[PDB]
Amino acid sequence: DVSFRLSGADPSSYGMFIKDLRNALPHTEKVYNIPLLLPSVSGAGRYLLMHLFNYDGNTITVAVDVTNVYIMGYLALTTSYFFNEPAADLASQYVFRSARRKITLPYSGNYERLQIAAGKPREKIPIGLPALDTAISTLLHYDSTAAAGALLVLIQTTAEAARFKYIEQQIQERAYRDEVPSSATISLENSWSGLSKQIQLAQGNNGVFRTPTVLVDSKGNRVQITNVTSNVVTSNIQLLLNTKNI
């Protein structure tokens, strides 16, 4: 399992959590020095449990699929909650079985569905460590509209930061003040599967992407990624989604 406490948290302790979360995901191979997530993991071993604690010390446990870093559901007190999707229903056969009750959320876990439920796109929802404290608090008692926004914060400040060094740094900059994600952050989230695929196809193709990935950069300018020498590949992406799952 991995853990993070918002009480006393700083950029340093958040960076330790994100390192722990990365190191908890199994791999047997690296591709261009980046860990390649497993094609599949059978049984309960396919779920990592993240124990998150709000500033007041209350906690939820989040279940993460180790092959794709997708959050499946979470436990809050004696109630489990799962996204309305087959992967999550399958996860509910393995995790938080001891919960008194299981609620299926009224939406799947994809960004588009969550944004619909929350009533706003990611671009307008501030993220940061204070926003993560709020999200944990919100998830502690069921409210499916408030939970959608909370989950958009939770996904970005955990899974997306594990996947991209730049996003981890963006959250560290928001340790004590929330701010909506940069356009580059949104860009990277949206391109993770694409990037992971192109880096894996570059093996067999002399480090060259079969198809170029379009991204927005730090200064807000729109760049094209064509090969593994790009900073996105050498210094940013930390985990690769297996092409078997793409």
Ligand X SMILES: CC(=O)N[C@@H]1[C@@H](O)[C@H](O[C@@H]2O[C@H](CO)[C@@H](O)[C@H](O)[C@@H]2O)[C@@H](CO)O[C@H]1O
The residues assigned a catalytic role are 160
**Which segments of 93-156 are extended strands (E)?**
101-104
Which of ligand NAG, ligand X, none interacts with 85 (beta carbon under 5 to 8 A by kind)? ligand X
Q: Using DSSP, state whether 238 is helix, strand or coil.
A: coil
Which of ligand X, ligand NAG, none interacts with 104 (beta carbon under 5 to 8 A by kind)? none
Residue nearest to ligand X (CB): 109
The answer to whether 163 is annotated as binding is yes
Using CB under 6 A as the binding rule, whether residue 227 contacts ligand NAG is answered as yes
Q: How many CB atoms lie within 10 A of CB 241?
A: 22
Count the residues of the shown chain that bind ligand NAG, applying the rule CB under 6 A: 5
Sheet with 47-53, strands from edge to edge, namely 2-5, 47-53, 59-65, 70-76, 79-82, 101-104
**Residues facing residue 76 across a β-bridge:** 60, 79
Q: Give the single-character DSSP code of 55.
A: T
Using CB under 6 A as the binding rule, whether residue 208 contacts ligand NAG is answered as yes
Q: Which stretch binds ligand X (CB under 6 A): 28-36, 69-77, 210-218, 219-227?
A: 69-77
Using CB under 6 A as the binding rule, whether residue 200 contacts ligand NAG is answered as no
Nearest-Å Rg of the Cα atoms of the chain is 17
Residue 26 near residue 47, CB atoms below 8 Å: no
Q: What does the block give as tokens for 55?
A: 């500033």
Name which position in 35, 73, 109, 181 contacts ligand X (CB under 6 A).
Answer: 109
- Please identify, using beta-carbon distances, which residue of 10 and 106 lies nearer to ligand X: 106
Q: Using DSSP, state whether 59 is helix, strand or coil.
A: strand
Which of ligand NAG, ligand X, none interacts with 70 (beta carbon under 5 to 8 A by kind)? ligand X
- Of residues 42 through 61, those in contact with ligand NAG by CB under 6 A are none
The answer to whether 109 is annotated as binding is yes
Using CB under 6 A as the binding rule, whether residue 138 contacts ligand NAG is answered as no
The answer to whether 173 is annotated as binding is no
| Long-range contacts from 232-237, C-beta under 8 angstroms, 24+ separation | 232/188, 232/195, 233/32, 233/34, 233/195, 233/199, 235/165, 236/164, 236/165, 236/166, 236/188, 237/34, 237/163, 237/164, 237/165, 237/192, 237/195, 237/196, 237/199
Using CB under 6 A as the binding rule, whether residue 172 contacts ligand NAG is answered as no
The answer to whether 29 is annotated as binding is no
Shortest distance, position 204 Cβ to ligand X, whole Å? 26
The answer to whether 110 is annotated as binding is yes
| Residues forming the site for ligand NAG (CB under 6 A) | 208, 226-227, 229-230
| Residues forming the site for ligand X (CB under 6 A) | 69-71, 85, 87, 108-111, 155, 159-160
